[PDB]
């Protein structure tokens, strides 16, 4: 069975370098064209580079010409993308893919490349449950996760014990150049004040975790 496994993505600063690998199995890439295609978060597919069999001709998107180099080591059955002079616009999931029929018939799982010019851990503020909460009905509460960089943060509730009714919103890049998001959950109003609700916010880029107990605001 044809398999492609990418590796090598990670965090890097502008002007930095990264080398991605694409390990092929189930076929010999010496007989095929291979491609790198990337996908910025929330956006569409963009072709990056291609390499031909036998002659090893290389082809590149205009925006990466002269900074990226595609190559292959047929003895390791592996393709590579050497990425130098990285810039913010290069942030993306990078796929390697095999050519077929003027298209791409097998794809790897992708590896994430995040170009970052700052590292800042989040501030976490309560979205406190309304005192007007409908008794016998449902109340909403949450955590506002503000001013972090780069992506991502993960949010859980009660260390993963609370999952039903949770909505963690896609992050928004603010005009400040920092991300924010909110995570909310609906619960029975009758549980407010006697059931503990804690949001667990992890930001691995800054090695920061915040746990915030969200209580009704005292009056």
């Amino acid at each position: 069975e044809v398999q492609l496994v990418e590796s090598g993505g990670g965090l890097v600063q502008p002007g930095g370098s990264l080398r991605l690998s694409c390990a092929a199995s189930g076929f010999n890439l010496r007989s095929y064209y291979m491609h790198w295609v990337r996908q910025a978060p929330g956006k569409g597919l963009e072709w990056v580079a291609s390499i031909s069999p036998y002659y090893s001709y290389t082809y590149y998107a205009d925006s990466v010409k002269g900074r990226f180099t595609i190559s292959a080591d047929t003895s390791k059955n592996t393709a590579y993308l050497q990425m130098n002079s990285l810039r913010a616009e290069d942030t993306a999931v990078y796929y390697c893919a095999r050519h077929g029929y003027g298209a791409m018939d097998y794809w790897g799982q992708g590896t994430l490349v995040t170009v970052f010019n700052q590292i800042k851990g989040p501030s976490v503020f309560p979205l406190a449950p309304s005192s007007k909460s409908t008794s016998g009905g449902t109340a909403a509460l949450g955590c506002l996760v503000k001013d972090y960089f780069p992506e991502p943060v993960t949010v859980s509730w009660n260390s993963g014990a609370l999952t039903s009714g949770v909505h963690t919103f896609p992050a928004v890049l603010q005009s400040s150049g920092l991300y924010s998001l909110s995570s909310v959950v609906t619960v029975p109003s009758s549980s407010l004040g006697t059931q503990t609700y804690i949001c667990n916010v992890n930001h691995k880029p800054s090695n920061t975790k915040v746990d915030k107990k969200v209580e009704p605001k005292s009056c």
């Binding site: 018939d105 503020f125 896609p170």
Partner: protein, 212 residues
């Protein structure tokens, strides 16, 4: 150079519906056009190649065609595993271009949101900024007008929205709108209100600064 203009950017359909997605080339191009399907977190999957050839394993409800410089992907009878994002690809010599994608979402019946407003925390205020959050929980359709009023004055340019993908269980959306003010502006005003409009109904949730 070559551009593939894909339309529509998104559409809602029901199981059994006939779905048409179009990519318009900016100039004359070869028929080396492929279609992919992609689900969240997953790699694309090849559906069609050479504009109209079905890739093996792909069920026969998928087909592709070409007219002039218009390429079309058709799903004859939409099935539940077909809700996804679709992309066209054009190859001309070495240059490979993709359309910007089409998200195919599921139709369901109308559902009004539960609306909640959240004042800024006292802890945030001491930083000098105030975030006011309005939540629209589990509603359909996605289109909604969310307006902020501060002492009955309509706000513009100081709020942003975020929306979840369709829920896997109930096919609804949820949406947040966050109004961002300086602490000084926040403490100058009293009534904060989020007004949510869909069709013939508006729901406004408010609070008075200081009152609990």
């Amino acid at each position: 150079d070559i551009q593939m203009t894909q339309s529509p950017s998104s559409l809602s359909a029901s199981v059994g519906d006939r779905v048409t997605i179009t990519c318009r080339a900016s100039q004359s191009v070869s028929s080396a056009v492929a279609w992919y399907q992609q689900k969240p977190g997953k790699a694309p999957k090849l559906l069609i190649y050479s504009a109209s050839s079905l890739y093996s394993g792909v069920p026969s409800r998928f087909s592709g065609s070409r007219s002039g410089t218009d390429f079309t992907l058709t799903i004859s009878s939409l099935q539940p595993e077909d809700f996804a994002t679709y992309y066209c690809q054009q190859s001309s010599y070495s240059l490979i271009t993709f359309g910007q994608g089409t998200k195919v979402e599921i139709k369901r019946t109308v559902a009004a949101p539960s609306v909640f407003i959240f004042p800024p925390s006292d802890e945030q205020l001491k930083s000098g900024t105030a975030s006011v959050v309005c939540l629209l929980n589990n509603f359909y359709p996605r289109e909604a007008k969310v307006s902020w009023y501060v002492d009955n004055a309509l706000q513009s340019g100081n709020s942003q929205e975020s929306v979840t993908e369709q829920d896997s269980k109930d096919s609804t959306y949820s949406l947040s709108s966050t109004l961002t003010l300086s602490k000084a502006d926040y403490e100058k005003h009293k009534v904060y209100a989020c007004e949510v409009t869909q069709g013939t109904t508006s729901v406004t949730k408010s609070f008075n600064r200081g009152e609990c």
